Amino acid sequence: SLTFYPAWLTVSEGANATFTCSLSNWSEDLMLNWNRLSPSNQTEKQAAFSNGLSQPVQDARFQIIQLPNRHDFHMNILDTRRNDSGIYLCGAISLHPKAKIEESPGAELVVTER
Amino acid sequence: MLFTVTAPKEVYTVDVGSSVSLECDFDRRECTELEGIRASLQKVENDTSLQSERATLLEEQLPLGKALFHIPSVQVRDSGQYRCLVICGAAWDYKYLTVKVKASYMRIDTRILEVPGTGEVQLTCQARGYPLAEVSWQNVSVPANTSHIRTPEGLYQVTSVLRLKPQPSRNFSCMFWNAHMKELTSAIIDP
């Protein structure tokens, strides 16, 4: 089970925004992805966390930090820009032979002028 | 690693009884280790993403950065949302794909009957297909009665019944409009 919150977040451009992705069960085989939805609701990978490391896909302003309780993660967008406005979610899978893709509900970011 | 998966096509429209090859491309330069690639397809049902047991991975396409999943003789129960998932080492990505299905209302069975007592004729058209068709009768002002059921295979059987006083030398044409697929089919009834 994953939650992603606050369900909506509004910030001025330049702000370092945070969503929290919370997992019901963490284990070190899990790989956590932070995704953004396209206009047609397709998932698009922003960043990943696995083996203790945050790895952005193409924009290093997207950082994932695992909090000390190992179950909660801060999904941070540094130096937000208007173009970051949209819907995001987190997803997890294990490396196990029988693994289901699990996803959190979507959360909306609105980044406003100035 | 910077591993991503893309889906060149988001919606597949498939004829019932024909195959589909669902594709997702992946990044080979960030997954040079072709040995530890795991590509799979899941169908989403009851908000649960379980592996598909209908699809076969055409693994001969993997070296070319393409995960292709073949489903033979697609049925109505195969429609809906899927996820293609690729894992390479300690990274993964996925994409959603929609399968929409179609079955042409191509076989139209017809009937003509005289309605004892009334002097009227009863004309019937019946055809199976997918999604639900609407039926109209060309150049007839009397309304018909149209209904449907579902068949065991998930198709709609649509039946339209028109009852009227038969006009001299006049044929009656029933027209099935499969709106979601923009297809018109028709049959002529000669009384």
Curated annotation (Swiss-Prot), chain A:
The protein, known as: Programmed cell death protein 1
Region annotated Interaction with CD274/PDCD1L1, chain positions: 37-44
GO CC annotation: external side of plasma membrane
Biological process according to GO: adaptive immune response; B cell apoptotic process; negative regulation of B cell apoptotic process; negative regulation of immune response; negative regulation of T cell activation; negative regulation of T cell mediated immune response to tumor cell; negative regulation of tolerance induction; positive regulation of T cell apoptotic process
The keyword Oxidoreductase appears for this protein: no
Effect of disrupting the coding gene: Mice grow and develop normally but exhibit splenomegaly, selective augmentation of IgG3 antibody response to a T-independent type II antigen, and enhanced proliferative responses of B-cells and myeloid cells by anti-IgM and granulocyte colony-stimulating factor stimulation. Mice are prone to development of autoimmune diseases. In a C57BL/6J background, mice spontaneously develop lupus-like autoimmune phenotypes, characterized by proliferative arthritis and glomerulonephritis with predominant IgG3 deposition.
Tissue: Thymus-specific.
Keyword vocabulary terms for this entry: Adaptive immunity, Apoptosis, Cell membrane, Disulfide bond, Glycoprotein, Immunity, Immunoglobulin domain, Isopeptide bond, Membrane, Phosphoprotein, Signal, Transmembrane, Transmembrane helix, Ubl conjugation
Residues with attached carbohydrate: 16, 25, 41, 83
GO molecular function, one term: signaling receptor activity
The protein's assembly and partners: Monomer. Interacts with CD274/PDCD1L1. Interacts with CD273/PDCD1LG2. Interacts with FBXO38; leading to ubiquitination and degradation by the proteasome.
Residue ranges of domain Ig-like V-type in the record: 1-106
Encoding gene (name): Pdcd1
Extracellular topological segments: 1-114
From Swiss-Prot, chain B:
GO biological process entries: adaptive immune response; negative regulation of activated T cell proliferation; negative regulation of interleukin-10 production; negative regulation of T cell proliferation; negative regulation of type II interferon production; positive regulation of T cell proliferation
Cell membrane among keywords: yes
Domain Ig-like C2-type: 104-185
Residues bearing glycans: 46, 139, 145, 171
Tissue: Expressed in immature and mature bone marrow-derived dendritic cells and splenic dendritic cells. Highly expressed in placenta, liver and weakly expressed in heart, spleen, lymph nodes and thymus. Also expressed in some tumor cell lines of lymphoid origin.
Topological domain ranges for the Extracellular compartment: 2-191
Family (UniProt): Belongs to the immunoglobulin superfamily. BTN/MOG family.
Identification of the protein by name: Programmed cell death 1 ligand 2
Source organism (scientific name): Mus musculus
Taxonomic lineage of the native organism: Eukaryota, Metazoa, Chordata, Craniata, Vertebrata
Section covered of the full-length record: 20 to 209 of 247
